[PDB]
Amino acid sequence: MVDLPVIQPRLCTHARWPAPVYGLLVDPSLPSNPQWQNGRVHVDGTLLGTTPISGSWVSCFAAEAAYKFQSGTGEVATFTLIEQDGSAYVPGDRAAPLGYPDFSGQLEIEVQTETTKTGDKLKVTTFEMILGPTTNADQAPYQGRVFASVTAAASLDLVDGRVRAVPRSIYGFQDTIPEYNDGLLVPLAPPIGPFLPGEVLLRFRTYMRQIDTADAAAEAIDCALPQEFVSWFASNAFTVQSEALLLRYRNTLTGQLLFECKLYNEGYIALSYSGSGPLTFPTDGIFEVVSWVPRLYQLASV
Amino acid sequence: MVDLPVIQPRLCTHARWPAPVYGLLVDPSLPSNPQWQNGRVHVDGTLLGTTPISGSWVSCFAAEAAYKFQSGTGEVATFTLIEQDGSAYVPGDRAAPLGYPDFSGQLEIEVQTETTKTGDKLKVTTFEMILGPTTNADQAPYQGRVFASVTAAASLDLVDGRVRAVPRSIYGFQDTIPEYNDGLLVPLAPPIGPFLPGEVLLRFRTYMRQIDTADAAAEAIDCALPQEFVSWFASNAFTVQSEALLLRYRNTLTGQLLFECKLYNEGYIALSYSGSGPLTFPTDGIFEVVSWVPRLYQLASV
Amino acid sequence: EDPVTGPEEVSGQEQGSLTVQCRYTSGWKDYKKYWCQGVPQRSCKTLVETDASEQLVKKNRVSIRDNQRDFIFTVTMEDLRMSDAGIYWCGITKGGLDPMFKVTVNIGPVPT
Amino acid sequence: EDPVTGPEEVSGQEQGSLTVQCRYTSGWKDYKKYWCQGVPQRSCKTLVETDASEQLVKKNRVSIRDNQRDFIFTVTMEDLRMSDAGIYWCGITKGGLDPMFKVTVNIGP
Ligand SMILES: C[C@H](CCC(=O)NCC(=O)O)[C@H]1CC[C@H]2[C@@H]3[C@H](O)C[C@@H]4C[C@H](O)CC[C@]4(C)[C@H]3CC[C@]12C
Numbered sequence: 001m002v003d004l005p006v007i008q009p010r011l012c013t014h015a016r017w018p019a020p021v022y023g024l025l026v027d028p029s030l031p032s033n034p035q036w037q038n039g040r041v042h043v044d045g046t047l048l049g050t051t052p053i054s055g056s057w058v059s060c061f062a063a064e065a066a067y068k069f070q071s072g073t074g075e076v077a078t079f080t081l082i083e084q085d086g087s088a089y090v091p092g093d094r095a096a097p098l099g100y101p102d103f104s105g106q107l108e109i110e111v112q113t114e115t116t117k118t119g120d121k122l123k124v125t126t127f128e129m130i131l132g133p134t135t136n137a138d139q140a141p142y143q144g145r146v147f148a149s150v151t152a153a154a155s156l157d158l159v160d161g162r163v164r165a166v167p168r169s170i171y172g173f174q175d176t177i178p179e180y181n182d183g184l185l186v187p188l189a190p191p192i193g194p195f196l197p198g199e200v201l202l203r204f205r206t207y208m209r210q211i212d213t214a215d216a217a218a219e220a221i222d223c224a225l226p227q228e229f230v231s232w233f234a235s236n237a238f239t240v241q242s243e244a245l246l247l248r249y250r251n252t253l254t255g256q257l258l259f260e261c262k263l264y265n266e267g268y269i270a271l272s273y274s275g276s277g278p279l280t281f282p283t284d285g286i287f288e289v290v291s292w293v294p295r296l297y298q299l300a301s302v
Numbered sequence: 303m304v305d306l307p308v309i310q311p312r313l314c315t316h317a318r319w320p321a322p323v324y325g326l327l328v329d330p331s332l333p334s335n336p337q338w339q340n341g342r343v344h345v346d347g348t349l350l351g352t353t354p355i356s357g358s359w360v361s362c363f364a365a366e367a368a369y370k371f372q373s374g375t376g377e378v379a380t381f382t383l384i385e386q387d388g389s390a391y392v393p394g395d396r397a398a399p400l401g402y403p404d405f406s407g408q409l410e411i412e413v414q415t416e417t418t419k420t421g422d423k424l425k426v427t428t429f430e431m432i433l434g435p436t437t438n439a440d441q442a443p444y445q446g447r448v449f450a451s452v453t454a455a456a457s458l459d460l461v462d463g464r465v466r467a468v469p470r471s472i473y474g475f476q477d478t479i480p481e482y483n484d485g486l487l488v489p490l491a492p493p494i495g496p497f498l499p500g501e502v503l504l505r506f507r508t509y510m511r512q513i514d515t516a517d518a519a520a521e522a523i524d525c526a527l528p529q530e531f532v533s534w535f536a537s538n539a540f541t542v543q544s545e546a547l548l549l550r551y552r553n554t555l556t557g558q559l560l561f562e563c564k565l566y567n568e569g570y571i572a573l574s575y576s577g578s579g580p581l582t583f584p585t586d587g588i589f590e591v592v593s594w595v596p597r598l599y600q601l602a603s604v
Numbered sequence: 605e606d607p608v609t610g611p612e613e614v615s616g617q618e619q620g621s622l623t624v625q626c627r628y629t630s631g632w633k634d635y636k637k638y639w640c641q642g643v644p645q646r647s648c649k650t651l652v653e654t655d656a657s658e659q660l661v662k663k664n665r666v667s668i669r670d671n672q673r674d675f676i677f678t679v680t681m682e683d684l685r686m687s688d689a690g691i692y693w694c695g696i697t698k699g700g701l702d703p704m705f706k707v708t709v710n711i712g713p714v715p716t
Numbered sequence: 717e718d719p720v721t722g723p724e725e726v727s728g729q730e731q732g733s734l735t736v737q738c739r740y741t742s743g744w745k746d747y748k749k750y751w752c753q754g755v756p757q758r759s760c761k762t763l764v765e766t767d768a769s770e771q772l773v774k775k776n777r778v779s780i781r782d783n784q785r786d787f788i789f790t791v792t793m794e795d796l797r798m799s800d801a802g803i804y805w806c807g808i809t810k811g812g813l814d815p816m817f818k819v820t821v822n823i824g825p
Pocket residue numbers: 062063064082083084085086087111112162163164320321322324509510511512520
């Protein structure tokens with residue numbers, strides 16, 4: 001028994017930003033070997049990087065929040081990070097708590113805040129948090145500490161306590177790992193790869209809620225596998241027999257074959273594509289496992 | 303034969319509010335037979351109510367948004383609803399588009415908005431939207447039409463277009479179905495049940511981001527199955543051989559049995575519990591399938 | 605200008621009465637008016653509603669009458685109780701989001 | 717009260733220069749000061765930074781000098797190009813969130 005969940009891409013959950021999958025494509029123009037830390041799983045069930053089981057952990061974090069007002073900046077939150085199930089975060093062999101963002105830019109986050117001001121007790125406060133690539137904020141989620149702030153003329157009278165932070169929007173998105181440890185290197189899942197000559201990465205794409213003062217173009221973010229596949233492998237714990245799995249992407253109502261591809265053991269899909277521009281595929285198909293294959297198995301082009 | 307994902311509840315996704323599963327309990331004081339529309343699936347893979355596959359669809363919707371300013375109300379959004387994958391929504395055999403909230407209260411939603419105003423273009427706006435139980439807003443998601451608003455002194459100069467609305471907070475939550483069709487009846491998945499005498503519903507609990515002016519108590523919302531079980535069944539499409547599945551909930555690090563329960567074909571779990579007060583359980587166990595049983599198999603009390 | 609306005613806060617006393625005047629712009633003359641209770645705003649419990657005429661309506665201890673000449677509908681609450689305190693709304697019925705105005709109602713005891 | 721304040725907007729014309737005075741409170745005397753460029757705010761491009769002394773620093777077309785008796789550090793930008801218009805920041809280097817003040821730079825031809 002080695003199979004995939006019978007779920008169309010358009011109905012799947014994205015693995016690096018909590019939103020549906022909207023696109024399926026290959027693009028030789030983009031980095032062929034991204035070092036994404038979320039949405040990384042071995043076919044045998046081993047989660048890699050900061051990949052979580054649940055899509056609700058993706059691009060989120062939990063923490064003990066301590067708030068302090070700073071003239072000239074506003075209300076400042078010092079988040080002491082926890083794993084999103086409440087278990088203690090211990091700096092170890094990964095970049096950050098499971099699900100922490102693995103991209104850069106300025107992130108609007110939202111947390112439950114209790115206030116002491118009269119007439120309101122519970123509200124949701126939007127903070128700004130700089131992720132990367134480089135920052136003067138000295139973010140160190142690897143060490144379990146990050147800083148956010150919200151513009152405030154005076155104290156918001158917030159009560160310190162535990163929080164779960166979820167992303168509201170991205171500002172100046174860059175698909176490059178954030179500042180995990182004040183600019184120092186941390187344990188990272190390796191760059192996705194390798195690929196045979198003529199093979200390129202299959203990309204599951206969604207789009208992120210964006211702040212952009214000039215450009216209305218949507219912000220894309222790709223992942224190697226949808227979150228359904230991540231938990232599917234984590235739960236099944238398959239025995240791996242070869243370097244990759246031969247898959248066929250089909251429309252089951254027609255049976256028409258859209259393309260064949262190789263799902264490497266290490267959790268990415270490669271298509272043989274010699275074109276130069278992006279090639280988008282329909283998202284209403286199903287991935288079908290055919291057999292185990294060796295690394296040098298040559299795919300048919302598309 | 304039916305099997306289940308080897309995932310601990312504390313690592314699963316809640317199926318009615320997009321957030322982690324934090325609690326696992328029974329509570330006789332709560333309604334024994336709720337009419338939840340999400341988190342409803344048949345063991346043979348049949349989705350019930352408005353249940354979607356992806357957890358990112360839970361308590362969200364997609365729409366063609368049209369904005370008109372109303373003096374005394376602010377910016378008013380008329381959402382012509384779409385299925386969250388872009389497929390045209392057609393009134394049919396369920397209460398609303400897939401994933402639409404199945405509870406009541408006043409919901410803050412976030413959508414991508416585009417403005418024509420100088421100095422900015424894309425931003426994320428929070429709207430207030432009344433769900434139910436009854437409203438004067440004439441909400442009719444069954445017909446693909448709902449209304450929301452954000453208080454404002456003048457037009458925000460928003461550009462009509464497509465949106466994905468995600469939930470920010472709940473105000474005045476009530477675990478009763480919302481206004482699906484301006485007070486009229488709509489097709490609904492039946493209440494959860496029935497149960498044997500002495501059997502009660504197993505609840506997977508998360509807590510919702512809340513606006514509350516007086517009370518700091520968290521707002522619990524329960525569901526019958528984690529989203530991982532929903533997708534697991536929809537994908538596998540098992541063959542059902544009796545009325546229910548006998549399950550054991552163990553700590554697999556110890557083999558300690560925490561309780562036995564019955565997963566009925568119609569998508570809900572029952573425990574034998576005679577107490578009157580609530581009883582919570584560890585969230586780090588695993589559900590294991592034992593065998594098919596009749597609807598009359600009497601469980602060991604807890 | 606706003607379509608319907610009234611007093612932000614009123615205070616009545618036990619066994620007493622209150623009168624609330626909801627002023628509205630002429631465009632809403634031929635719409636139904638009503639008086640609502642509770643929060644959230646748009647799931648509030650309607651206590652009395654007109655039929656878009658000027659006929660007076662009374663239900664329990666609440667009455668409403670629309671003066672479509674001066675564009676004011678008047679609400680009266682009689683035999684006030686402590687339990688009557690809370691948030692209320694002047695309302696104009698229409699398709700979709702109704703024009704509404706928040707009216708906080710305080711009730712206290714007659715001092716001794 | 718605010719740890720650092722400067723001009724909200726400043727202007728110069730192409731090929732000219734401009735000066736920016738970043739006033740700060742006395743406690744930040746012995747901290748590095750810097751002049752940053754671009755948004756997002758806290759990932760901006762540092763153009764020049766001091767060594768916490770009064771020594772003037774010059775890098776490309778930008779210089780910074782900290783006057784620690786009056787508690788002002790002065791920034792100059794020379795040979796102004798239209799490409800220099802945008803968002804800049806008076807900065808003070810410290811652990812965590814740096815004290816920063818937004819300065820908008822405009823360029824006329
Ligand atoms: C106050 C919030 C509930 C409201 C909220 O902030 N978010 C709910 C949502 O995602 O919509 C509570 C409810 C349960 C809490 C979490 C759980 O207790 C588990 C865990 C416990 C740790 O002590 C702190 C983090 C962490 C993960 C908690 C964070 C805060 C939570 C989430």
